[PDB]
Point group: C4
Amino acid sequence: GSMYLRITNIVESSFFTKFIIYLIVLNGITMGLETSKTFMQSFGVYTTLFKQIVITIFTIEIILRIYVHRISFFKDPWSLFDFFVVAISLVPTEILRVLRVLRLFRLVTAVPQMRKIVSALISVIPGMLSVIALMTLFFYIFAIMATQLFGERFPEWFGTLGESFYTLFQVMTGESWSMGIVRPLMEVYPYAWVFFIPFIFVVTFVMINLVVAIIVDA
Amino acid sequence: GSMYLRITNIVESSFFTKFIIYLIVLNGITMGLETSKTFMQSFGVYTTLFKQIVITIFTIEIILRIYVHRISFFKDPWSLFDFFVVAISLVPTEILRVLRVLRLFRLVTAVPQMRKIVSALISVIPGMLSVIALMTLFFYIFAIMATQLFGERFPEWFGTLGESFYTLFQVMTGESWSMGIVRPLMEVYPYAWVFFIPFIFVVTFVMINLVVAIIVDA
Amino acid sequence: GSMYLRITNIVESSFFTKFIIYLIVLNGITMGLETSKTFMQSFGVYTTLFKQIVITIFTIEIILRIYVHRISFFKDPWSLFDFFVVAISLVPTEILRVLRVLRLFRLVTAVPQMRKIVSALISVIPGMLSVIALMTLFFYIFAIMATQLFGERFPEWFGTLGESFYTLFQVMTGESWSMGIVRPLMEVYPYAWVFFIPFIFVVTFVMINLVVAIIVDA
Amino acid sequence: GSMYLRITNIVESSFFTKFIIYLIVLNGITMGLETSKTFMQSFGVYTTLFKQIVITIFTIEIILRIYVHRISFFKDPWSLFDFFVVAISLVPTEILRVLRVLRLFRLVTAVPQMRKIVSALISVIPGMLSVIALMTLFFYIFAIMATQLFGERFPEWFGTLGESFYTLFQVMTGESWSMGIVRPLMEVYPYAWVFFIPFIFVVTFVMINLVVAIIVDA
Ligand SMILES: CCCCCCCCCCCCCC(=O)OC[C@H](COP(=O)(O)OCC[N+](C)(C)C)OC(=O)CCCCCCCCCCCCC
Ligand SMILES: CCCCCCCCCCCCCC(=O)OC[C@H](COP(=O)(O)OCC[N+](C)(C)C)OC(=O)CCCCCCCCCCCCC
Ligand SMILES: CCCCCCCCCCCCCC(=O)OC[C@H](COP(=O)(O)OCC[N+](C)(C)C)OC(=O)CCCCCCCCCCCCC
Ligand SMILES: CCCCCCCCCCCCCC(=O)OC[C@H](COP(=O)(O)OCC[N+](C)(C)C)OC(=O)CCCCCCCCCCCCC
Ligand SMILES: CCCCCCCCCCCCCC(=O)OC[C@H](COP(=O)(O)OCC[N+](C)(C)C)OC(=O)CCCCCCCCCCCCC
Ligand SMILES: CCCCCCCCCCCCCC(=O)OC[C@H](COP(=O)(O)OCC[N+](C)(C)C)OC(=O)CCCCCCCCCCCCC
Ligand SMILES: CCCCCCCCCCCCCC(=O)OC[C@H](COP(=O)(O)OCC[N+](C)(C)C)OC(=O)CCCCCCCCCCCCC
Ligand SMILES: CCCCCCCCCCCCCC(=O)OC[C@H](COP(=O)(O)OCC[N+](C)(C)C)OC(=O)CCCCCCCCCCCCC
Ligand SMILES: CCCCCCCCCCCCCC(=O)OC[C@H](COP(=O)(O)OCC[N+](C)(C)C)OC(=O)CCCCCCCCCCCCC
Ligand SMILES: CCCCCCCCCCCCCC(=O)OC[C@H](COP(=O)(O)OCC[N+](C)(C)C)OC(=O)CCCCCCCCCCCCC
Ligand SMILES: CCCCCCCCCCCCO[C@@H]1O[C@H](CO)[C@@H](O[C@H]2O[C@H](CO)[C@@H](O)[C@H](O)[C@H]2O)[C@H](O)[C@H]1O
Ligand SMILES: CCCCCCCCCCCCO[C@@H]1O[C@H](CO)[C@@H](O[C@H]2O[C@H](CO)[C@@H](O)[C@H](O)[C@H]2O)[C@H](O)[C@H]1O
Ligand SMILES: CCCCCCCCCCCCO[C@@H]1O[C@H](CO)[C@@H](O[C@H]2O[C@H](CO)[C@@H](O)[C@H](O)[C@H]2O)[C@H](O)[C@H]1O
Ligand SMILES: CCCCCCCCCCCCO[C@@H]1O[C@H](CO)[C@@H](O[C@H]2O[C@H](CO)[C@@H](O)[C@H](O)[C@H]2O)[C@H](O)[C@H]1O
Ligand SMILES: CCCCCCCCCCCCO[C@@H]1O[C@H](CO)[C@@H](O[C@H]2O[C@H](CO)[C@@H](O)[C@H](O)[C@H]2O)[C@H](O)[C@H]1O
Ligand SMILES: [Ca+2]
Ligand SMILES: [Ca+2]
Ligand SMILES: [Ca+2]
Ligand SMILES: [Ca+2]
Ligand SMILES: [Ca+2]
């Protein structure tokens, strides 16, 4: 209809998208300020009133956007994300506030250069599914072995399957791998390094190949 | 013979290989569950009975695979590995259980994309034999020097040749290289950094070249 | 005029530029010596007198350089920097001395190979503005979440927005990310790793892409 | 002369070079064994007698090699190194033994693949002289500033110019940069991170470019 054309010439207009960008930035600063407990004592009413106005504007904006292109909305991942973050931040007023902080990625969603770069980073991922699965299998296997080997005398670190996964991820990142893990272990299990030095070697060699493999796809 | 043809049309069939894959995954989950001591109190008989059934199936499968292509079996590295892991997990019921956890790499062996990627990672290795030998020689030489220099007043870290190898591998990875090693050393040996700063420099420069050399072979 | 030509055949002469280089090097050594408190007790008058002579020479040199090409001087970034560092080191005799130490980058400014390489390093930067903005937004968002999640029971590290920024930069560099932060946190907040393991993953994946993206522009 | 031809057909023969290689390997194992204090109690006379025989053989070998091609000997870097290490290990029987351990790099010198790879690693270095000089200047400048800023209240780490160089190299490698340095500093100097976060940023950005620049020369 004639009115459908007009609201789409508003929605797909550069200005309306720029306005939702401005609301996003003001809102994000607001969230930066809301951590300041003294600032909150000073301006809780002003900021919270502001929050309510910006969220209502956001909700009606998502509604109009759903109107213009319905099928396109729920098969487009950026609008899918915008829908999902606003819905998350729509519920009546614990961890939900922490997620509400994610509304600021809508600044990625709105800004075309930000879209270009995020889709670039995601387009890198398919190629390394093979190595992510290899590494996941590897971590699972060594985690079970480390749990059954050190989990009893070292419950804090290898006690269960999760704690072992975590200590193996920590060892892979390199963080206190020896003075923190392998050397305290060796006070009781002196050939513990047979388990970790090969583990280090494989992880790094794989992690280095993953980085190499990223490049060649250029 | 006519029967030899039929069992090979089963063995090299997509379905039989997929079945051994399914047994592998169920088994791997089982090994994940067997760490849960309460779950083990609950279902030790069910899981262990399951273990026995899956291992017998695996053994007869390795037998049939050896039948179809004997010479091909012991010159193929993937089947060599499958033979070796099942043989490891075949002995009567300490560290053997920990190895038995390696049966899950048979999931790498069975899955063609997993084969492709592992053979890729191995095909990277020949080219860097030269640098691995250089680095091994380097580590040996500096390990002997560090043992003879700090091994007496620092027995925990450089006392023997092994402890020195380990502290040098730890220093190469970077982990607590200073606050943990070089700075405590300098409380007694104040020009210990003449030994380590050059050591750091050479190791990293070599480690960076090894990464570079990997790429160019593309 | 005839005299303007002569002073420009001095200023743009290889020798005058080499002389200001020599003054820079002598001065830099002087600053190296001035840290030695015993050396300062010995030669405070000689070095400080030297400082005054070299700085006056520098000031009149910047004056003549401004004369030869005025518009060119304040639109050229290297001379802009030379102007700014000498002006910084021109004020009557706390933190100003620490900045005065930056006069030694004038050795970068004077030396053509140094110019070539610094302009190379700067020419790398435009291309990664997109990712620097993405990462800044990311750090802001996770910093607000970490402040509101751990800032109360962990004021030292996530108490305000700044301390959270710092602990997140520290976690990104990898330094004591677990034994130092995430594991002490988990003594009180046991699913704190839901916040950090994804955070680690995104940061590294982005940091690795930033390195990759640098290369391709070759 | 006719005899000069024969000894050169021995010296440049594959067999004579292989023999000095064998002596090198036996000797290197000997040095590995000499760290074992119980093994030394057992076989000090056998090993030391062995040492004397192998070193005399080495000396006469260096003499003959100097004979065949004199000018070529002192302008060739590999033979220069062989001369220098044997001369080092030639003096009458403290730190000299530690250097004597370097005789094992003669295994690099003798082995052609080892020569190829070491000359490759050295051939990488000229191209990065520019950045090594930039980084050295950078380290000098920030070291002077850090000494004058934190050297008094933190003598252990920034007290002199050397301790500052070391703490800056440690911070560059990343090792305990925060929990170990910057955070203890901030207990007294709360805006110390203005000095280190920029320092980190520049170092890494430069260190990443140095790695990139290595590649392109392919
Ligand atoms: C992209 C660049 C981002 C730049 C962000 C830089 C943030 C720096 C934060 C510095 C905070 C430290 C200063 C400070 O002294 O902390 C105190 C304040 C609030 O005081 P507070 O701790 O509430 O005092 C309580 C005292 N009591 C309990 C006894 C009553 O706590 C604060 O000061 C918090 C200050 C809020 C700063 C908000 C900045 C928003 C930047 C927006 C960037 C663009 C967004 C797209
Ligand atoms: C860094 C801050 C994040 C903020 C998020 C903000 C909201 C983002 C949600 C929507 C994301 C949209 C991304 C996207 O559209 O991906 C497209 C990519 C590359 O597209 P493109 O380069 O156009 O090529 C696609 C082929 N074509 C042209 C024929 C269409 O092609 C693909 O999508 C390939 C499929 C890859 C799926 C990978 C899954 C990502 C993993 C999720 C992260 C897990 C964290 C632990
Ligand atoms: C770009 C996409 C990335 C790749 C795809 C997704 C990567 C993650 C897939 C990993 C699948 C396994 C996740 C998992 O095993 O979760 C279990 C544990 C549960 O921990 P929990 O028992 O609650 O730990 C508490 C520790 N304690 C005792 C001290 C209180 O939670 C953990 O401990 C998680 C530890 C890190 C998991 C990462 C393991 C390797 C991931 C795959 C390798 C790719 C490169 C890292
Ligand atoms: C590839 C992705 C892998 C995903 C793996 C994620 C694993 C997460 C493990 C989380 C474990 C922590 C939860 C927990 O509360 O621990 C307790 C349980 C067993 O309790 P338990 O510690 O035995 O209680 C004893 C109490 N007592 C001594 C007083 C009687 O200990 C456990 O909960 C162990 C839980 C077993 C989980 C097994 C998951 C198998 C995933 C299969 C993936 C595909 C394989 C190819
Ligand atoms: C992709 C293939 C990888 C390259 C080929 C294989 C690499 C390994 C070859 C190294 C050859 C030497 C192995 C070796 O020296 O083993 C001896 C020691 C024995 O340790 P031990 O005396 O039992 O240590 C206990 C420590 N303590 C006193 C605190 C209880 O055990 C250790 O300490 C091992 C320490 C790490 C050894 C790595 C040394 C450099 C390896 C070559 C360099 C390539 C990049 C790293
Ligand atoms: C680019 C390569 C740069 C090379 C730089 C190497 C610097 C090495 C610094 C070594 C310092 C440690 C030696 C030492 O024992 O420290 C003491 C001295 C001064 O003694 P001091 O600590 O004042 O004694 C006070 C005793 N008291 C309070 C009881 C009266 O404190 C000092 O020794 C400071 C020594 C000044 C060395 C200046 C070297 C300038 C190199 C110029 C490079 C080219 C510049 C473009
Ligand atoms: C090549 C160009 C580089 C990229 C452009 C510039 C990068 C920096 C842009 C970051 C914008 C935000 C800076 C910022 O948030 O400053 C606020 C805080 C204030 O700290 P403050 O509250 O005074 O901290 C004291 C800590 N305490 C409680 C223990 C005493 O100060 C900090 O904590 C700073 C912490 C590091 C900030 C870096 C954050 C990510 C930067 C963007 C990511 C690019 C790769 C890192
Ligand atoms: C390239 C690959 C290199 C492979 C190197 C692997 C080295 C592993 C070293 C393991 C050392 C730890 C074993 C151990 O229990 O230590 C004790 C022994 C000597 O005993 P010691 O500590 O003297 O006993 C004294 C007892 N006391 C004071 C009360 C009388 O101390 C020793 O055991 C030292 C053992 C010497 C091993 C020498 C191996 C040479 C490998 C040659 C490689 C090729 C060279 C080109
Ligand atoms: C890793 C274990 C080390 C063990 C050492 C054993 C003894 C080694 C001493 C002798 C080294 C000989 C190296 C060498 O010949 O370098 C030649 C390189 C590359 O040669 P090439 O690739 O043939 O190209 C040269 C051009 N051409 C064909 C016309 C001659 O061309 C160049 O030489 C260019 C000049 C570069 C000088 C760089 C100085 C190296 C820094 C020293 C390390 C400092 C440590 C902190
Ligand atoms: C491939 C070739 C590599 C590049 C060319 C050579 C690189 C080294 C050139 C650096 C020139 C300056 C060397 C220097 O400043 O030496 C002075 C100090 C003296 O230390 P000292 O005062 O004896 O320290 C004792 C510490 N204490 C108080 C706790 C007992 O000794 C130190 O602290 C040395 C600390 C590390 C020096 C490295 C500085 C940056 C080097 C250039 C950057 C290239 C990438 C790192
Ligand atoms: C959603 C994002 C997708 C996830 C996949 C992206 C990769 C994530 C990897 C896990 C991150 C931890 O990253 C960890 O960084 C350290 C840095 O010391 C690596 O250690 C590194 O050493 C060498 C030497 O520099 C590198 O060339 C190599 O990349 C890596 O092995 C660990 O091997 C790696 O695991
Ligand atoms: C079976 C696998 C084959 C084994 C060979 C594969 C390589 C294994 C190397 C040993 C693993 C430890 O890896 C260790 O990672 C750290 C990460 O801080 C490296 O430190 C790194 O600093 C720079 C800067 O990022 C990197 O460009 C470089 O790759 C490396 O020198 C150590 O130099 C490296 O030794
Ligand atoms: C003015 C300069 C411009 C600033 C921009 C330049 C980049 C600066 C980045 C911040 C510096 C800290 O750098 C930090 O180094 C560690 C090394 O363990 C990285 O950890 C790394 O793991 C893998 C494995 O090696 C690398 O391939 C990757 O580059 C990186 O993710 C952190 O992810 C990175 O953030
Ligand atoms: C390449 C970039 C280099 C930038 C370098 C910046 C690094 C800064 C190093 C840490 C310096 C802090 O050192 C200095 O500490 C003193 C006291 O100790 C503070 O002094 C302050 O004390 C209190 C606190 O507000 C006030 O009442 C007082 O009036 C004020 O002077 C200074 O404000 C700070 O400058
Ligand atoms: C004789 C040899 C010649 C000497 C020159 C060779 C280079 C030596 C550099 C000094 C070695 C210390 O190496 C130190 O490794 C750490 C690894 O966390 C680097 O940290 C790294 O973070 C990122 C992310 O991975 C890397 O892409 C980058 O290479 C580097 O900045 C430090 O920035 C680097 O300085
Ligand atoms: Ca790391
Ligand atoms: Ca580290
Ligand atoms: Ca490391
Ligand atoms: Ca690091
Ligand atoms: Ca490091």
